[PDB]
Design a protein around this ligand. Structure first.
Ligand SMILES: CCCCCCCC/C=C\CCCCCCCC(=O)O[C@H](COC(=O)CCCCCCC/C=C/CCCCCCCC)COP(=O)(O)OCC[N+](C)(C)C
Ligand SMILES: CC(=O)N[C@@H]1[C@@H](O)[C@H](O)[C@@H](CO)O[C@H]1O
Ligand SMILES: CC(=O)N[C@@H]1[C@@H](O)[C@H](O)[C@@H](CO)O[C@H]1O
Ligand SMILES: CC(=O)N[C@@H]1[C@@H](O)[C@H](O)[C@@H](CO)O[C@H]1O
Ligand SMILES: *[C@@H]1O[C@H](CO)[C@@H](O)[C@H](O)[C@H]1NC(C)=O
Ligand SMILES: [Mg+2]
Lengths: 324, 814
């Protein structure tokens, strides 16, 4: 027939691979030979990383920061002494961790006006209905509407190094550059027009829990409102009940000295964020990084355990096929 | 009785001459199509879900569970409406035929559809009668005509019919006009051999002659006229009352064994869904029992949500979990199934192995709903006259291939017992060393002798056997004694005793069978000890009832007529084309769809299990793990094309090597690939992979940073890693099952992975002003700046595909 083409007659050219057991046995050896060395490389890298986490949520009678678990005068001030046995070599990063904090809760995640945080003129005055309980108060719309922005983490952590004398030398913490380039440079934008940020938020009001409006978060025009690094970092949800958020980074000194020399340090914290209502902890984490990121032995242990199981299975399936 | 006037003038309550081989008219198309579409449990479930989401107030618009349902329903309805429209056109070429009618002293030509009861029709030599005529006159003397009813009862001899003695000398289409008579005939009956009637010819002066009629005058519709230049008959029965059309048993809905396996799978996956939704709700309401677990001061409920009823909140939460996990029951699977059924049915029509030169046409596909059960046939019921017969080109070596494939061939004919047995010997169905167990009317000329030998040749002669040794011969009159008289003896029922012998002999021959008894045999076979898939292949109008009765009915485009090629599912213009139709086409058709339906459930279980495991680490708050842009696009964009192209043009065994070897047919016989064994393997593999994705991503997120610049990830980035691993694993899983790698498979398998990666680049990377969520602006583009995430994804892909590789190494050798 005139329609006796290859497609219509089911005779299209094909590859037809033969996946026999004699051509897959080398695959089990190749995979095991290239997974084990990778697993070792990710395993010593995870061990060379230095990381210290100190807990400061109080809840202990002999805890230095317990004295203001329910303080009478605010703001609270409390200091914690820790020591570094081994100096931190590269550029270290300051994190803060919160457990039992369900940021990945359906009623919490959807509680933002992403169009309003994008600098939209219309969404600024009349925010969305999803951020309902934290949407309007005093007849005025809340500028960072929603639970995510309303419950922003607002502790102040500072680090001091106890020198040869009693007086401490404060180490400099860098604020800018902790959030994603993309979600700070495009996704999070200020309202479009105006001379100063105090004028762009005319009809809006600050969140109830905040002490200062969004336009007074920082004295830096590039870090003032809706583009604040800390606000942007907090407004990215957590994916787990216990999480960590980047707080500051300590750039490596131009000298040969390590960024965090071994010694006794002070972590003196302005205890502003309460977490003991929902039985949540609160810690500060300093850590060095690598090509893979932070300290996690899961990848190193899994790659070795996978490349050694496949290798042994290949040996077994090779000795077995020696009978025939 | 009815009154018929010969010239259609006095000397209404009857229908019009028309053939209806189609199912739906314009009035009952929707009500009848809805019943067939809602026989599917997924459609019923998603109709119930849509109905509940409208009557009550929900946080879930009904549009999420109503648009897919409406799309599926009108996708599988356009196909049925178009397929039945071709059957409407098939009846047009026979209804709007050409017939000549002696209206008034003139040979006006009407259509075969415009014949009324009581008009003198004229039929020439070799012409089939348009309706049930009564022979009034023949041009020659003696008023005798010869009729061959080879399509009505399978007899090859010429039968002689007699005209009416009063009107034998009326010819030339002129004296017919001057004929006044009234026919008082019996209301139509399907016996095909008896007829009672009367003619009351009235002359100008006086004629009270009442010549009693009989079957020797009636000319049936569908029987050709031979060795007579022309005749002059008067229509009495005019379609849907013709004796040929009264033996049609009535159309029903045919559904293959794969469509019934989908309903059984949907029952298991409905229990998984209701278990997930119940386990999540029960654990949610014990988690929320802690005062600080709900309203923890950082997300607080509104007043409306606080004052709502707790008992209504339980129901709403259960239904919300059901909506969250509803993808476990795929409705996009029906759109793929019907599309691949419609596009795969063209391989039968396009085949050049089904082309007959002497009649100049190939195979026909009336219905594409039963492509997959051509590879599941267990019994073959073949006519003889016209179908098996000299013999046909390969009528004997086609039966050998059917026997090697494990099929059972029964011959159901309406011809003489001796002729039929000689034909069965000729086609090597009854070999020389085959002892015949004749149950015909020759030895059963009584009612009680039937018991004396039905039990004699089964208990004492058949249990005392080889399988091939014996062969049964049954008659149509004796089968009536077996069936009708079995309503009294229930201790030793004649039907069961007869059926025991039928299943123990190599071949069964049924002779002198009425068209409604060949359907009764298929009905008896269809009901015994399970679900034997039955096939019936015929060429005449007496095979139509058994074609509409079997699971799949094949028709032969023979010289007798096209009555069995219009009421069938497929029509090959030869008996030998059944070998390639079943062995080569049915095998691939079943193998493709059985793999597709298993893969569709595996695909969705791997998609939903990580989202169910997320609830234990969320606040049990039915928060989706993946983005709304991923949840909807997973089934229609990322994983829709690779399985469509596989199940359309994938050959696990080359099309030229399973036609040569017929013993590969029994490998898949008995719904082998849709059984509990394979179902459990696919479900357990899907559960293992779904657990691996989530718990390999969860242990990776204990780092506080996955990249070198020390930046943290959110919940959406947690969801995109799981989704990437899931998509790559379920796509590379099908690449391992592919044995026919065409350039189209290379384009839809590697083009689906290359499109998902770029869609991440594009969806994340362009700001749309009209959107109001903007929650995935650069999630993947910041995900790809970390080496440790790439290494984890590749590791989780190989771990999940490790059982498949192990089974390929173990089972697929020796
Ligand atoms: C879509 C755009 C982004 C959405 C924005 C985000 C918000 C959306 C929110 C609301 C819901 C939207 C739903 C609308 C759509 C539902 C339609 C529906 O139902 O028919 C869908 C389309 O049929 C199909 O299988 C597709 C047709 C058959 C297969 C052929 C594939 C055709 C497309 C291929 C393009 C791929 C090309 C590129 C890759 C390959 C390389 C070349 C199937 O249903 P489903 O499985 O998707 O539904 C399940 C969800 N259940 C249960 C709630 C209803
Ligand atoms: C003042 C006192 O009682 N104990 C302090 C202790 O809290 C610290 C330590 C630092 O080395 O110096 C001593
Ligand atoms: C749990 C918690 O911190 N609640 C406080 C609330 O008592 C106070 O009235 C409000 C105003 O700053 O800030 C918040
Ligand atoms: C920002 C500040 O200085 N103090 C705030 C306080 O006003 C608020 O009530 C509390 C609730 O989280 O968080 C802290
Ligand atoms: C560190 O915190 C303490 C807490 O009272 C407070 O005196 C001040 O903010 C800091 N002190 C020094 C010495 O850095
Ligand atoms: Mg026939």
């Amino acid at each position: 027939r005139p329609d006796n083409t290859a497609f219509k007659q089911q005779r299209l050219p094909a590859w037809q691979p033969i996946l026999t057991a004699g051509t897959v046995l080398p695959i089990f050896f190749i995979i095991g030979l290239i997974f084990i060395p990778i697993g070792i490389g990710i395993f010593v890298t995870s061990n060379n990383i230095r990381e210290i986490e100190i807990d400061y949520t109080g809840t202990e009678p002999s805890s230095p920061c317990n004295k203001c678990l329910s303080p009478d005068v605010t703001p609270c001030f409390c200091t914690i002494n820790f020591t570094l046995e081994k100096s931190f070599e590269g550029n270290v990063f300051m994190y803060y961790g919160l457990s039992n904090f369900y940021q990945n809760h359906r009623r919490y995640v959807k509680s933002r006006d992403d169009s309003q945080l994008n600098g939209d003129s219309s969404a600024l005055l009349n925010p969305s209905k999803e951020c309902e309980p934290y949407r309007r108060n005093e007849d005025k719309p809340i500028a960072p509407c929603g639970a995510i922005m309303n419950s922003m983490f607002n502790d102040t952590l500072e680090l001091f190094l106890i020198g040869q004398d009693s007086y401490p030398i404060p180490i400099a913490l860098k604020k800018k550059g902790i959030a994603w380039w993309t979600d700070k440079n495009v996704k999070f934008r200020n309202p479009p027009g105006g001379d100063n940020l105090e004028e762009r938020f005319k009809g809006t009001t600050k969140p109830v829990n905040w002490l200062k409006p969004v336009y007074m978060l920082d004295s830096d025009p590039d870090n003032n409102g809706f583009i604040n690094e800390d606000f942007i970092v907090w407004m990215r949800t957590a994916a787990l009940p216990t999480f960590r958020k980047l707080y500051r980074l300590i750039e490596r000194k131009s000298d040969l000295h390590p960024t965090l020399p071994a010694g006794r340090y002070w972590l003196n914290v302005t205890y502003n964020y309460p977490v003991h209502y929902f039985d949540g902890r609160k810690r500060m984490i300093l850590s060095t990084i690598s090509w893979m990121g932070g300290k996690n032995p899961f990848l190193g242990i899994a790659y070795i355990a996978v490349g050694s199981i496949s290798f042994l299975l290949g040996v077994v399936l090779l000795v077995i096929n020696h009978k025939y | 009785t009815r009154t018929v006037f010969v010239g259609n003038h006095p000397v209404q309550r009857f229908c019009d001459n028309r053939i209806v081989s189609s199912k739906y008219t314009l009035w009952n198309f929707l009500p009848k199509n809805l019943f067939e579409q809602f026989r599917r449990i997924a459609n019923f479930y998603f109709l119930i879900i849509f109905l509940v989401e409208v009557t009550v107030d929900t946080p879930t618009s009904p549009v999420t569970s109503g648009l897919p349902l409406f799309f599926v329903i009108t996708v599988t309805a356009i196909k049925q409406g178009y397929e039945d429209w071709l059957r409407h056109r098939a009846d047009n070429e026979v209804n709007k035929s050409t017939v000549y009618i002696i209206e008034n002293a003139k040979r006006v030509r009407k259509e075969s559809e415009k014949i009324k009861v009581g008009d003198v029709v004229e039929v020439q030599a070799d012409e089939t009668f348009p309706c049930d005529l009564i022979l009034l006159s023949s041009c020659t003397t003696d008023g005798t005509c010869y009729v061959t009813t080879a399509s009505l009862d399978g007899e090859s001899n010429c039968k002689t019919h007699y005209a009416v003695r009063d009107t034998i000398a009326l010819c030339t289409a002129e004296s017919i006009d001057t004929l006044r008579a009234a026919i008082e005939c019996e209301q139509p009956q399907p016996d095909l051999y008896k007829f009672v009637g009367r003619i009351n010819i009235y002359s100008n002066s006086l004629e009270a002659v009442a010549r009693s009629l009989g079957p020797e005058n009636l000319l049936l519709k569908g029987a050709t006229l031979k060795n007579t230049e022309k005749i002059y008959g008067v229509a009495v029965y005019t379609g849907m009352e013709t004796k040929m059309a009264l033996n049609y048993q009535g159309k029903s809905q045919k559904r293959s064994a794969v469509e019934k396996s989908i309903n059984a799978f949907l029952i298991v996956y409905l229990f998984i869904l209701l278990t997930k939704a119940a386990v999540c709700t029960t654990l949610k309401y014990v988690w929320q029992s802690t005062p600080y677990n709900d309203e923890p001061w950082y997300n607080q409920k509104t007043q409306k949500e606080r004052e709502t009823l707790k008992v209504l909140k339980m129901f709403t939460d259960f239904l919300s979990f059901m909506v969250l996990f509803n993808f476990i029951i795929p409705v996009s699977m029906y759109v793929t199934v019907e599309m691949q059924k419609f596009l795969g049915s063209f391989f039968i029509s396009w085949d050049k192995d089904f082309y007959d030169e002497e009649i100049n046409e190939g195979a026909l596909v009336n219905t594409s709903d039963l492509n997959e059960e051509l590879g599941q046939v267990d019994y073959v019921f073949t006519d003889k006259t016209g179908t098996l017969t000299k013999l046909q080109d390969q009528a004997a070596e086609t039966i050998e291939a059917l026997h090697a494939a494990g099929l059972k061939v029964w011959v159901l004919t309406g011809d003489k017992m001796e002729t039929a047995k000689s034909t069965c010997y000729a086609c090597r169905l009854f070999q020389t060393n085959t002892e015949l167990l004749e149950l015909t009317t020759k030895t059963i000329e009584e009612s009680e002798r039937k018991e004396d030998r039905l039990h004699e040749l089964l208990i004492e002669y058949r249990k005392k056997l080889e399988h091939q040794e014996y062969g049964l011969i049954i008659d149509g009159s004796t089968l009536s004694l077996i069936l009708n008289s079995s309503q009294d003896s229930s201790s030793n029922n004649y039907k069961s005793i007869f059926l025991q012998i039928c299943m123990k002999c190599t071949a069964v021959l049924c002779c002198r069978m009425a068209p409604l008894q060949k359907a009764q045999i298929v009905r008896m076979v269809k009901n015994l000890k399970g679900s034997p898939i039955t096939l019936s292949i015929g060429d005449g109008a007496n095979d139509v009832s058994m074609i509409l009765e079997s699971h799949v009915g094949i028709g032969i485009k023979g010289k007798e007529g096209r009555q069995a090629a219009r009421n069938s599912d497929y029509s090959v213009p030869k008996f030998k084309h059944l070998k390639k139709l079943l062995l080569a086409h049915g095998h691939l058709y079943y193998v493709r769809i059985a793999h597709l339906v298993q893969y569709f459930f595996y695909k969705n279980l791997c998609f939903i299990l990580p989202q169910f495991l997320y609830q234990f680490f969320c606040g049990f708050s039915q928060q989706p793990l993946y983005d709304a842009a991923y949840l909807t696009m997973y089934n229609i964009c990322f994983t829709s094309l690779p399985i469509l192209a596989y199940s359309l043009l994938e050959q696990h065994i080359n099309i030229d090597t399973l036609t040569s070897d017929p013993r590969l047919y029994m490998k898949i016989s008995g719904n082998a690939m849709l059984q509990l064994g394979p179902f459990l393997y696919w479900t357990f593999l899907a559960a293992f992979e779904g657990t691996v994705f989530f718990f390999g991503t969860y242990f990776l997120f204990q780092t506080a940073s996955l990249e070198e610049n020390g930046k943290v990830y959110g919940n959406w980035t947690f969801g995109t890693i799981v989704f990437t691993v899931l998509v790559f694993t379920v796509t590379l899983k099908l690449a391992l099952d592919t044995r026919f790698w065409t350039w189209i498979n290379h384009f839809v398998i590697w083009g689906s992975l290359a499109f998902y990666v770029f869609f991440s680049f594009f969806w994340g990377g362009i700001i749309w002003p009209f959107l109001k969520q903007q929650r995935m602006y650069f999630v993947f583009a910041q995900m790809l700046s970390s080496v440790s995430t790439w290494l984890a994804i590749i590791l989780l892909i190989f771990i999940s595909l490790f059982p498949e590789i192990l089974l390929i190494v173990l089972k697929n050798v020796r």
